[PDB]
């Protein structure tokens, strides 16, 4: 039995709105109609685990013990957008109360005594937690040009401000997993379409997205089709999920509200940024973290500046960022391929080619990528899979060469072979 549980949002925190856009794969710009926004419960919100179990046998089912171990491990995701940042939950303070409802001493305990405590650690000792196959990818990176995602709307002293999110007591700058997923997907598709020389220009955006291997890695929209008199769904969830990436720097919620509500770039903005950057008495260090920039459009006949075309950006030139977490669900792919681990190698080959470009500055991130922002240096990719099949076991590695040369040449040469064999015939690899 699972009850409803009310969510208690942290103190002063409130429901956040996340903006979303779909970027046309041909023009590189927002697709028409593909603008949306999502309310989200902020990170660190709590709710009660409300389970009851009515045992007809003695003891407790081991699968139900594995479930509680999985919750404590944080392996369960809840709600929407699970591949695009949202939904991870972890259990704390697990408590087990047993009522022996089969007996008078137990039935009155249910009515009066509030039950018999069990030590969870004693059950937690009698089982080995079997985590399913996955490949965790941790990319360690720093911004080479200021990296930001733009806030939802224009500011006062500063028009373009970074997106931030609540993370408990403090706000942090955030790059949503939606944004990191979307840049990775775009490069993955460009690689596939390049190999096939398949043009993207005549397709609308929902058809542009729908191409081979990426349909399994990044996932596809639900879409019923009577494909062969048989009726089939084209939709499948992404086997690849991405987390929101937060800044190492943090500010109290009011400290950032002082930045959002500054009105003079040389006036009351300067105290606010000195506060938030952590150099309340040293602006020349404050502006090595967040630096206001001014821009003009210059009229082509007169010079000077075009009437009205003056704007400013709060560039997070020096915000340091935590390592990006990508989680690849090897079990979910292997289910799509009806078990055949031979079929993983083209999908794994694609993913490693995407990561090769990320480390070679070929995938810029966030706002203004063509306009002085968004280029990242990758220092290290750590590949850490659990229960990988033995022929993929060489993935468990920490890589620092951008060109993957830290993966075994025999393994890189094996992946290249399965990849080349797919290039020679790019079938729908999950078609049994």
């Amino acid at each position: 039995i699972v009850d409803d549980a009310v969510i208690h949002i942290p103190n002063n925190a409130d429901v956040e709105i996340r903006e979303g856009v779909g970027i046309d794969r041909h023009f590189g710009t927002a697709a028409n109609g593909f603008k949306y926004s999502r309310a989200v419960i902020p990170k660190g919100s709590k709710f009660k685990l409300p389970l009851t179990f009515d045992s007809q046998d003695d003891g407790l089912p081991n699968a139900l013990i594995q479930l509680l171990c999985a919750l404590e491990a944080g392996d369960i995701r809840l709600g929407a957008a699970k591949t695009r940042g949202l939904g991870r939950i972890k259990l704390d303070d697990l408590k087990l109360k047993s009522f022996a409802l089969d007996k008078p001493e137990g039935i009155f305990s249910a009515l009066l005594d509030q039950g018999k405590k069990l030590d969870w650690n004693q059950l937690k000792a009698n089982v080995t937690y079997q985590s399913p196959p996955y490949l965790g990818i941790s990319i360690t990176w720093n911004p080479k040009d200021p990296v930001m995602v733009k806030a939802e709307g224009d500011g006062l002293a500063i028009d373009i401000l970074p997106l931030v999110s609540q993370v408990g007591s403090d706000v942090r700058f955030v790059i949503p997993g939606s944004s990191i997923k979307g840049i990775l997907r775009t490069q993955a598709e460009r690689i596939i379409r390049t190999i096939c020389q398949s043009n993207g220009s005549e397709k609308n955006f929902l058809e542009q997205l729908r191409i081979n291997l990426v349909n399994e890695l990044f996932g596809s929209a639900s879409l019923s089709q009577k494909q062969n008199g048989k009726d089939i769904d084209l939709g499948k969830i992404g086997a690849l999920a991405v987390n929101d990436c937060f800044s190492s720097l943090s500010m109290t919620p009011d400290q950032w509200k002082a930045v959002e509500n500054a009105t003079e770039m040389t006036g009351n903005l300067q105290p606010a940024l000195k506060q938030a950057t952590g150099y309340p008495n040293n602006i020349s260090q404050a502006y090595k973290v967040l630096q206001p920039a001014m821009h003009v459009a210059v009229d082509r006949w007169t010079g000077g500046a075009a009437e009205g075309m003056l704007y400013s950006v709060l560039e997070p030139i020096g915000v340091t960022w935590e390592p990006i977490q990508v989680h690849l669900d090897i079990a979910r792919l292997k289910n799509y391929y009806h078990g055949k681990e031979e079929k993983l190698k083209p999908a794994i080959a694609l993913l490693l080619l995407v990561l090769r470009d990320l480390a070679n500055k070929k995938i810029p991130v966030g706002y203004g990528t063509n306009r002085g922002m968004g280029t990242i240096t990758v220092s290290q990719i750590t590949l850490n899979g659990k229960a990988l099949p033995t022929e993929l076991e060489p993935l468990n590695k920490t890589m620092t060469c951008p060109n993957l040369t830290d993966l075994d040449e025999a393994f890189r040469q094996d992946l290249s072979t399965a990849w080349k064999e797919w290039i020679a015939d790019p079938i729908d690899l999950c078609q049994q």
């Binding site: 709105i17 939802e152 709307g153 224009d154 006062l156 009437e307 009205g308």
Partner: protein
């Protein structure tokens, strides 16, 4: 009505807000459907293929109105309008509207005005004594956001028709 001391008065209040919210949403849909009303309420209008102001100017205002959670946030929206009104090129973007910047200033700063435009008979929608005055003060900011949201949507999807001629 329920007496003010009545124990279920807290539960009745949950039911009323639900009946009010849906009434406001439905009425806001109807009022956006007609171009004379969008012009009455916000001054916005369509002139040939052109939109007054541009949809970008409506979108900019709307993004600020998202911050109007409470009456004490009306400082935020009136602050935006004064800064707009102070920049000559931006103020003139809203010329050829029917007084649009004053109409927005009024809608946000006159607490009675949203309810007169919605013009809903709330008597069938309330059961708590003193419910009408309380719910009006509580739902004010939400009604303003709902009506402005509806009007701009209805405007844009009529603009698409004049565009596509």
């Amino acid at each position: 009505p329920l007496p003010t001391n009545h124990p279920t008065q807290d539960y009745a209040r949950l039911i009323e807000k639900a009946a009010w919210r849906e009434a406001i949403q439905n009425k806001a849909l109807a009022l956006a459907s007609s171009r004379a009303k969008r012009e009455e309420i916000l001054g916005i209008k369509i002139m040939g293929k052109d939109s007054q102001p541009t949809m970008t100017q409506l979108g900019g205002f709307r993004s600020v109105l998202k911050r109007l959670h409470s009456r004490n946030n009306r400082d935020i929206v009136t602050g935006y309008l004064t800064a707009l009104e102070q920049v000559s090129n931006r103020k003139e973007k809203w010329s050829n509207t029917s007084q649009g910047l004053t109409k927005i200033r009024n809608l946000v700063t006159q607490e009675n005005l949203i309810w007169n435009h919605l013009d809903i008979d709330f008597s069938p929608l309330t059961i708590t004594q003193n419910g009408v005055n309380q719910l009006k003060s509580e739902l004010w900011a939400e009604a303003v956001r709902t009506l402005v949201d509806a009007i701009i949507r209805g405007h844009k999807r009529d603009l698409e028709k004049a565009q596509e001629n």
